[PDB]
Amino acid sequence: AGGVEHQQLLDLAQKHLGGIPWTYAEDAVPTLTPCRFTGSEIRHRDDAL
């Protein structure tokens, strides 16, 4: 953002970021989950503070 013109940034991006692999190596896929929320608590001390 700022003084950048979009098409310059894109045409420039093609010459450098285009070398990044796109098809997954080993076809790896991350496995996200709707993770749980515990009701626990932690209570560290050090009374001199």
Place this chain on the structure above:
Amino acid sequence: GREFGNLTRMRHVISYSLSPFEQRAYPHVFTKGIPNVLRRIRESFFRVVPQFVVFYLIYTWGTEEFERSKRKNPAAYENDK
């Protein structure tokens, strides 16, 4: 002057916990509870029971002795004559 902020100094003793709703009221009862109650009772035995057994002995002996003197009293009249 013994409110919780006024109590003893203590330092880095971290403690972990859980919500009551997050955990069941009776965990591992069959596997961990009963054997625990058993080791407790096994510790309690010899320190407690035998003296009560001595009470049972003095009790039965006293009852048998009173009942003996009482009903052998006429029998004491019998050996008397």
